[model samples]
Target: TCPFYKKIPGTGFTVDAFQYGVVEGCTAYFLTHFHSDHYAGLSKHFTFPVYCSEITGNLLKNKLHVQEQYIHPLPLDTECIVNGVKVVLLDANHCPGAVMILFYLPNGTVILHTGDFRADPSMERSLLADQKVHMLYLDTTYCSPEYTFPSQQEVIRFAINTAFEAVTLNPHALVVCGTYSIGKEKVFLAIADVLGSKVGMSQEKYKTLQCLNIPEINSLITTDMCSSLVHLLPMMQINFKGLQSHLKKCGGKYNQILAFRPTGWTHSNKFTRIADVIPQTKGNISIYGIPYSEHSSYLEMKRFVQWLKPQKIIPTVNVGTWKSRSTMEKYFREWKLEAGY
Candidate 1:
């Protein structure tokens, strides 16, 4: 679905996909994460030497049923060689096993593929230390001034507190937090830990979270929907109709249901420049749309490029309106001019 899948200029390694009609002429494949969008055309019958993080590899093998023979585990921050090109994996801070790929080309160019990550200060010490990025493939999902959101930690805290407040207000209320299958695990885990309750998920989601092996998560996930005070629903199933259906299915067990959609789109003010937490409630459902995004905001992206100082910035996702290469270039130039650089 995206044409950003291209072979590194002089390397045999191809990124993201192999059979999505986006890439060709590559001996090795690299997967940034196990998100469905990133693994569009991947299937069990495919046979290619794929490289990714250990968790992503496990998900590919167990969930997607990819063959083990073709899966290669690339540990974070460790350098490895594939066809004479040096490669390293760095944490993307997006999901459980998401990582950014760094390729050191034979021609002395260092290309960075930011596999959908939020900006974290620690990345400077871990991924950008002493490295000159020649090209940057960025996750510009929220690359607009209208998307300024709070840090992940703050958003998680706000969500947890809000959930607890909801429960406190209504003793028999059921709190539902919306998230993708692989993301926002921390939000669920934190809410459960704080409320002294267990988190509920679908069988498939439980399987994916189990692979993470975090004791906090492992001890808290449950499939019994009736027993859970908090339910972690997939993002697609978080709307009013979905919750109404869920409330109907639950019968008299829950007196009320409150839903929170933690996303970056909460802030709609284009003139606002700072990150803050504001919850919007509609009828029985309350959606925070918290800035708990895994992708960098426009301000964060600007700071990242200023620090990395890459010669060229490439948009990673080509499927969306704001993700065009030219759009990203325009934003880059605008930020540069604003910074007087």
Candidate 2:
């Protein structure tokens, strides 16, 4: 009965429904990624086996202190048997631990749930390309025409270029980049590497990244925040007021701040500003909003729908009242028809 939670047909498994923990008759819970939005209800009191990618499983245990016993970290791209059903995890290209879940149920139906994903051309070679997914529980975050934006590569290039420009104009300014609780790790990592500046964060923040065990990333992180010119903070923390708070605690170290906040929303229904544009500045702080997204662009989503040609489609995000969400459904209906499936 949970809204928009995909219950695999003829199976006791539920995908991306940890928010409704212990759903009746649900034997397995699939966390497609580590993002809070998808894994909302999961906590230290986890009562069911959570199937997720290895990084995500380790994160649950280390970050949430959820016991490893209930976390089943499955390998990606391999056939796995879970409670008699066959499943596979494929690259989502959304976040580090993100995946698109594929399920082959006992009744011979194949289902795919793309949890918060950005469709890329590389996805064409994935095993799902060969699968006739009976149902596609999709990440329809940007399913409308108005959500058009450039590719992540184009946007990341813009951000890196922007960072270079900002630092040039104000060499003394501390460079602050925005990141989510998870993912977007690449954004800052790329910037830090290009700038040749250490990525500074609070001790806790650094520890979280360490859990992922990427040595290249670990090599760039610094606990002593003042040692680095570029510091990483959550999106909300990089705002004007928040930047002031950061500088104040700096013990008079930085007089100005240059912050880059990358988001998909800027590029719809996504772009409130042009992709190549100016930053908003007030006094000593400048915040640049870049057109970066982890979700599929409108174009990408259409191509994905065309490529997969699933038997049935379900919109897993942007769902409110069915009446309100029908705006998105109209696109899916027409697209599905055009796919000739």
Candidate 3:
């Protein structure tokens, strides 16, 4: 049996004690990050002592409003004993409070789980320096060459330039961009810096942004001002043509209204088709397609996996969601290791 015994099926294994009747045994539980996929199911199953990075703990408590008795806040690079197992949190750089975990067993076996990590060299170096990892659980969501994106700074520069140029051309134009209420708050600030004004956002998103504690970018714009110059609204607002008409009546020309979408939307065929319907002719309505995904591309993922050279590699998240397991298995097959047990 593995050092961490009692597989909890949906989540993972436990150490010595399982608070939830379903969990048989557990020494301790470690949360890799704060994303819904990684952490949502956690509170449901186990009430055992849970450990994670400081940022993650804050997000879980403050952002998610999940106050549990067993939540333990840990710092990066610092090893803490949980249920007699050594655990460390490393920077993932996927989002504000994201982290990859490294769990060490008493028998010298190490398991490194890359929780939605990316090779964001331009942003921050991967925090995997000098650590010996044995088994690696990777996020192979974009383990294909086609999804590789340019540096975040490069993408941000492109997006800012395109957005500012759109607004500068038509001062009365409205630009709407889709983004999550949480996680991607930086894009809004970047947009404000480029437009030199506040941009409008959905009520829900606005509330989330406020909770983020970023004072410099509070409600850069409001919903009532959608007719105003270069409004940044969420994508949930349907009736694109109708909204355009309303904007035009409010002094925004048809050509002056442009819809900018987040990079993740392009992953779907339908969203891509709908986003392509911008009014490109009259008032210069255009869709600026900026690639700004947080996940690592196939090449970057491969590079990270190869560098670690873990004895076993398990793909998580998007691995089996959209594609078959063989898709990820094929990618792992190309690695230098003859066989990953």
lDDT of 3 by residue, 1-341 (tens): 33232232224444222233444444456666556645645543345666777666766665556666767887776877665566767777687667777777667777777767776543234445565677777777777655645666765666677668877876666666666434655565677667766666556555555544455554465555543454545555423564555465554244555665565525543343332433334344455555667788776777666666777666665543545677677778776554353
TM-score of predicted structure 2: 0.93
- Ranking, lDDT, top scorer first: 2, 1, 3
Segments in model 1 whose C-alpha atoms lie over 4 Å from true places: 1-5, 21-23, 267-287, 318-324, 334-341
Which one is best on lDDT? 2
The sequence of per-residue lDDT tens digits that candidate 1 reaches over residues 154-250 is: 7677777777888888878888888775877777778887777888878988888887747666578899887888898878888778888887888
Collision count of model 1: 0
Cα lDDT listed for each candidate = 0.77, 0.81, 0.59
Model 2, residue 201: distance off in Å is 0.5
Clash pairs for candidate 2: 266-270, 266-271, 267-270, 267-271, 268-271
Q: Give lDDT: candidate 2, residue 254.
A: 74
State which candidate, 1 or 2, has the greater lDDT.
2
Instruction: Evaluate model 1: give its TM-score.
Output: 0.89
Stretches > 4 Å off in candidate 3: 1-22, 26-29, 42-48, 121-127, 211-232, 238-255, 265-285, 318-323, 337-341
Which candidate, 2 or 3, has the higher TM-score? 2
| TM-score, one value per model | 0.89, 0.93, 0.75
Predicted structure with the largest TM-score when compared to the true one: 2
lDDT of 1 at 211: 78
